[PDB]
Symmetry: D2
Subunit: 319 residues, 4 copies
């Protein structure tokens, strides 16, 4: 092909720009021209497309968010929608599409190949809940953002000998909470994928307190419930002075981490290598520390799980 | 004197340890011995006092929180309380007291001099709401913590073209929100000390949006009300996709900033110079960029204000 | 006036962009139009001038360096040079000039007023060696960059029980080294403005070692000499395993600190208030915690000094 | 077994403490008791051994360096040395040994099993040059330290349109330089494991300059030669204003990254699981994203390589 497109959809993640940057550079090295779609699917339909030159991606490697923006397009679910967007691609002479984003987003990449547009999905979410990849672009970054918070909370919490319930993102996945909790020396990690017993959780807290622990840190994936309900519950049952912190969206921004920058680079490139080689309908990732690619349709069938053994470890080191 | 005490009271702040460290080193340089009171006023009464050696304060300069801990002692308000604590000092042969903390805390330093115990207050709060000082120990740190958050929020907010209401600490003071808002390129700063008109606030937001601004950042000092109420209000009136972030206690911890480290050092030292020179009942600070000291009783009479001109500036650069 | 110019000269500093941003916003609020000079004096002559619109300064507040670039123009020392540049201003209809930069730079602002061009200097250097100001834009940032280094060096140095000689910037001023050394718990601070005796320096190191200190940290302002010579000297005399680190230019970049962001904002604004009020030939600053302005010619006469008492403190807390 | 030892040898790395912490907690969970050896091999001989209690490892997770210290013991190469140390273990009733460190260090773990002391090596180096593992504890941290530097250098370098030669650690491995260079948008990466042609390197720089690039960033692994020689060489051949930065030991310290914290946790635990299960003479690691363990003797036979394809990528995205 001679012309490809690139867009960002779903929630933004740190590292989207390094991704955009490798697609752009990878394609040009190869003499292919790159077009940017602004506002994701929404601007695909609206024809918000501009050519990206070698230098338009200069000085974005270290930046958070996405320079192409992102938007929610519920009109792309529609036949008409996929038609209108498909028209826009042709009007511009764009033959392939690199889509960096979530699972919601991969679904649209799929619908596009089915109508003849070769697309490759690049996993961009802070959640790490994308099949076909061990790691998603932006997860490392979010992790470091969270332990940055925990580190701070531990200082205040030691000072006043208090218990903190910290609510982290990851709507349906416990990755953030699990790796965070571990890296942060947390005393409890409540994730979606594991059963917890509130009485055992309490027993364990009490026992650590008695054994002379100054603070207590509890990580709750938003996926489980609210930081406020667990705070309430725990304070009632232990009589310990409790506080709740909802990190929120700070999790979503920042200058991506080295890993995130390398990961995004490598995957965004790889995505281009596939469009050129005529592959299409695939999604890229990293598995067992190697670059892999799947069929979107089949990677989507698959389910997201965590290392249950890591969760155990959590429980053993928290003594 | 030959023996002094040092304690931390009120909410902990980044830089308390560098403070503790200068009191300890300053006193020993001078051949005076230093005693630590653990758990603030509460442990004063309980006699939780240990001698601090030159090296006990080694490797704390860069740390957040307070190695002496802090506690709320509502029994120190009481005559008996001040008696019991006064007894504990004598039992240990402690003649002077450096108290690092809030205004609540300065009140107790006052009650102590009145019963004959020379005390000097060291302003330790992230709030910056202590009379006699331009700057309180830990404020610089909190500031940097907050703009760290704003920086991140701006990335996500630009990405999705959204409006963010960010709630910062400072119970009755607008310092955090004001300096933050300014350093952060915020579009609105709602502080306690200034009147705001919600209709004007709205008008100004709308006008920036129209003039092509991608995101919108609103800083609300907890002192004004809730980030959630302003979010609600603003979304209703503009129809802009809004999100709210409550930074909370991350504001309170972390490795203190260079300024905070210098400030704490200089003030903690100065406090010792006063106890030795027999001054007592005073509080230290920095005014017009010089070390000053006041009478606690008179500095407390005084009121905390902000630079209203800085607030204006806020409004002019936000166009 | 209706049209002003703005430029950055000398070595770049973190906070130049927040400066540029307040000049730009301050001027427009006032209905004045702002022109940017690229490449400092050099591009003034070459006529590298572009109009700056309200949004061209959007999203630069948190960034390091200067979006207008900077260059060394030894042709501006020349009559012809100042003529050619003066011509360029007129050709564009620019009546005033905000110059953000060093002392070298202030000299040119001076030469410009003398030929009739109202100019105001904004102190932008990481060195803090500019008369008329307590603090220069970028100094807070450099400070935090350095203690960030020290913090790291302390970890490795404790680990292996070693002595580190750390060379910091500040060509003729000891500010960086002094505040750094203090905030960093350094054992020695060699600055230009103070006499040191290498034998005493040695004695003091030895004595701390014996008293059980694991590491040893020595800060040397480049202004004094080389980190390598002091390393050599010290190792020879103590037999302690020594290492040298030259921080270099990392000191010069980064996302400016809250203070730096506020300071730059306030000063860049103030500079505009002066051009409008017809003042000219002045330089802005912060003194005794208040915005002040001087005559460039007289502020330049003045000399840069440090708080000698802060240096003493250094020596007392280092026991 | 009922009693194990743990020590840190070689150059310290961020994450050693999280390692120490999992060995300590993992062993106690299991009812085994843990002994700490201070000063690595050197203190093994000298009998510098103290029992580690559950709480002695509290509040070290987020810290750099090693709380057990490290030292170079050239007397441990010696039969006598291994005898004396072996004696010390027995004198204390220590049956197993977890050794966290470099390859030099793994060699001693080997010599110890051969004389009957079960030992497991934990890869702790910032270099990433340890066989049996994809990743070594502390590498992620060093990486982030370096791109932190690059980010800063890019600001100053863009400002003045200059070329920077940045020298990074990794004595014989190009990992730091390679991942750094990539994550940092570097224009050249000179590593040991790849051939470079200085004329091509020059050609490529010139070509980027002409194509309008403001700065230029060159990463040189110390393993290749000196930042100063490449600076010299490059400046001579391009006439571009060049600067050199030697990051040095800042690479070695800091609060470990989330990955480093998880990695160290998981590996330090695993090491204990092996001593209990009677395995011995093994080394742990992570391969293809899974915990693996090897025979020290055989993992040492193996050689350290990099992803040559990642190096290519480097070259393609740098256009
Ligand atoms: N064509 C161009 N016009 C203006 N600036 C450019 C151009 N190409 C590159 N730059 C800038 O030069 C610097 C180095 O460029 P480049 O190597 O391509 O960027 P990066 O390392 O971010 O990919 C960056 O600030 C970049 O944005
Ligand atoms: N079945 C679908 N067909 C086409 N596009 C879809 C489909 N599902 C989602 N998308 C597209 O992807 C955009 C991003 O999807 P969304 O679910 O909101 O992302 P996320 O799951 O990451 O939140 C959608 O709004 C829409 O345009
Ligand atoms: N008496 C001591 N025993 C153990 N460690 C000590 C002792 N004195 C100092 N240290 C350690 O040596 C290092 C340097 O000491 P010092 O200069 O006094 O600390 P700081 O710079 O934090 O004030 C730090 O890790 C400190 O904690
Ligand atoms: N009037 C008082 N007399 C004695 N001690 C007091 C008085 N007011 C406050 N304090 C002491 O200082 C502690 C810290 O006071 P507090 O108000 O809670 O701090 P803050 O105002 O910073 O929250 C109190 O709990 C108490 O022991
Ligand atoms: N006219 C414009 N065109 C494009 N982007 C703009 C424009 N004006 C503002 N923006 C962007 O909108 C966001 C908020 O704008 P603004 O408040 O003016 O910036 P800042 O807070 O940095 O001064 C930033 O990303 C800014 O760069
Ligand atoms: N006497 C002078 N007359 C005019 N311009 C001058 C004079 N001295 C310096 N400058 C201008 O300012 C630029 C910045 O000066 P320079 O000394 O290099 O900055 P710094 O002192 O901060 O390094 C100079 O190269 C030159 O154009
Ligand atoms: N026995 C103890 N004595 C004193 N402080 C302790 C003790 N046990 C734990 N702590 C402190 O309590 C806090 C929480 O403890 P812990 O969960 O064991 O630490 P971490 O999360 O670092 O492993 C930390 O500051 C820790 O150092
Ligand atoms: N052949 C060996 N036998 C025993 N111990 C050894 C051997 N080689 C190295 N060591 C031990 O490990 C310590 C750490 O080794 P060293 O090579 O200096 O670490 P690194 O290679 O990581 O620098 C040595 O000083 C020594 O006690
Ligand atoms: O950004 P929104 O629409 O508020 O949604 C928040 C969600 O986005 C994420 O931050 C990123 O996918 C999730 O963890 C979180 O539940
Ligand atoms: O720490 P607590 O008891 O929750 O109180 C929170 C208060 O403490 C501070 O963080 C520090 O004084 C205030 O800004 C805030 O209102
Ligand atoms: O940037 P150059 O030309 O190498 O000069 C380095 C000088 O610039 C500064 O970093 C900033 O003025 C000084 O501390 C240092 O001596
Ligand atoms: O710490 P030393 O003895 O100066 O040795 C420096 C070496 O240690 C490391 O920093 C860590 O192994 C290497 O990259 C570097 O060559
Ligand atoms: Mg969705
Ligand atoms: Mg814990
Ligand atoms: Mg109170
Ligand atoms: Mg703004
Ligand atoms: Mg000069
Ligand atoms: Mg020290
Ligand atoms: Mg060796
Ligand atoms: Mg580049």
């Amino acid at each position: 092909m001679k012309r490809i497109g690139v867009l960002t959809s779903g929630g933004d993640s740190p590292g989207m720009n390094a991704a955009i940057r490798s697609v752009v550079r990878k394609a040009i090295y190869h003499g292919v021209e790159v077009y940017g779609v602004y506002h994701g699917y929404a601007g695909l339909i609206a024809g918000n497309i501009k050519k990206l030159e070698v230098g338009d991606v200069g000085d974005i490697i270290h930046r958070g968010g996405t320079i192409l923006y992102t938007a929610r397009c519920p009109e792309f679910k529609t036949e008409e929608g996929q038609k209108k967007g498909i028209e826009q691609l042709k009007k511009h002479g764009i033959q392939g599409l690199v889509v960096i984003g979530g699972d919601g987003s991969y679904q649209g990449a799929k619908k596009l190949t089915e109508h003849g547009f070769p697309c490759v999905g690049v996993p961009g979410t802070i959640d790490n809940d994308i099949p076909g990849t061990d790691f998603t672009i932006g997860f490392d970054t979010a992790l470091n953002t969270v332990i940055d918070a925990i580190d701070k909370i531990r200082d205040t919490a030691t000072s006043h000998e208090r218990t903190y319930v910290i609510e982290v993102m990851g709507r349906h996945a416990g990755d953030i909470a699990l790796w965070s909790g571990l890296a942060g020396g947390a005393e409890t990690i409540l994730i979606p994928e594991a059963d917890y017993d509130m009485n055992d959780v309490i027993a364990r807290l009490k026992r650590g307190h008695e054994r002379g622990k100054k603070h207590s840190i509890i990580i709750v994936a938003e996926g489980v419930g609210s930081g406020v309900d667990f705070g309430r519950q725990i304070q009632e049952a232990t009589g310990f002075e409790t506080r709740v912190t909802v990190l929120g969206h700070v999790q979503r921004g920042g200058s991506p981490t080295a890993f995130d920058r390398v990961l995004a680079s490598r995957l965004g490139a790889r995505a281009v290598e596939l469009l050129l080689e005529g592959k299409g309908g695939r999604c890229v990732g990293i598995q067992n520390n190697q670059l892999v690619d799947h069929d979107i349709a089949e990677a989507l069938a698959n389910k997201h799980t965590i290392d249950q053994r890591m969760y155990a470890l959590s429980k053993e080191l928290s003594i």
